[PDB]
C-alpha cells in the first residue's frame, strides 16, 4: 500500500533479504508476499553479478560495517547518477547488500551478530531517500514491484 514506501517497511524488506542470504529464517508469521517475491528475483541477480564481477569483487575487502556503508553509498551514487530509477535497478540494491553481507561474513575484522541489521539500515536509508517517491508513484511494493515480478 501507499505507506509501504516509508522507512519501516523498506527496512524490513532489506533485513528479510539479508536473513535469506545468511540462511537464518526468523520464526513467526513468515515474510511478506513482497519479501517472498523479492528474495527470488534479488538472489538470481546476486548470483549473476557475483559471477560477472568476480575478479573485481575479489579486489575489495569489506572489513567493517563502516567500510560496507561507505562502499555501498559510493556504488549507489554512481549506479544512479544518470537519474534513472526502475524496478530492475531497485532489485540490484538488494542483490548488492547480499554481496556485502557475504563478504563481511568472511572478512569483518570484529564480527558482530547485529551487523546485518546495520547494513539493512543504511540500505533502507538509500532506498527511501533516493527512490521512495518514485516507488510511491509506481504503486509501491504491493501494487508496483509485486505486480511486475510475481508469477504469471
Amino acid at each position: 500500500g501507499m505507506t509501504d514506501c516509508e522507512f519501516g517497511y523498506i527496512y524490513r524488506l532489506a533485513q528479510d533479504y539479508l536473513q535469506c542470504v545468511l540462511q537464518i529464517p526468523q520464526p513467526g508469521s513468515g515474510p511478506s508476499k513482497t519479501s517472498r517475491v523479492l528474495q527470488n528475483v534479488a538472489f538470481s541477480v546476486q548470483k549473476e553479478v557475483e559471477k560477472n564481477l568476480k575478479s573485481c569483487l575479489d579486489n575489495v575487502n569489506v572489513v567493517s560495517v563502516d567500510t560496507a556503508r561507505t562502499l555501498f553509498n559510493q556504488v549507489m551514487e554512481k549506479e544512479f547518477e544518470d537519474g534513472i530509477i526502475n524496478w530492475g535497478r531497485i532489485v540490484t540494491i538488494f542483490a548488492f547488500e547480499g554481496i556485502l553481507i557475504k563478504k563481511l561474513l568472511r572478512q569483518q575484522i570484529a564480527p558482530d551478530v547485529d551487523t546485518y541489521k546495520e547494513i539493512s539500515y543504511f540500505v533502507a536509508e538509500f532506498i527511501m531517500n533516493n527512490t521512495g517517491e518514485w516507488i510511491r508513484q509506481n504503486g509501491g511494493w504491493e501494487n508496483g514491484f509485486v505486480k511486475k515480478f510475481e508469477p504469471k
Partner: peptide, 21 residues
Amino acid sequence: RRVVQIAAGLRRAGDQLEKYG
C-alpha cells in the same frame, strides 16, 4: 575504479532485468 566497475555492473543488470522481468 572499482566503485565505477561495480556500479556499472549493477546498472547493466538492473536495466536488463527491467526489460526482461
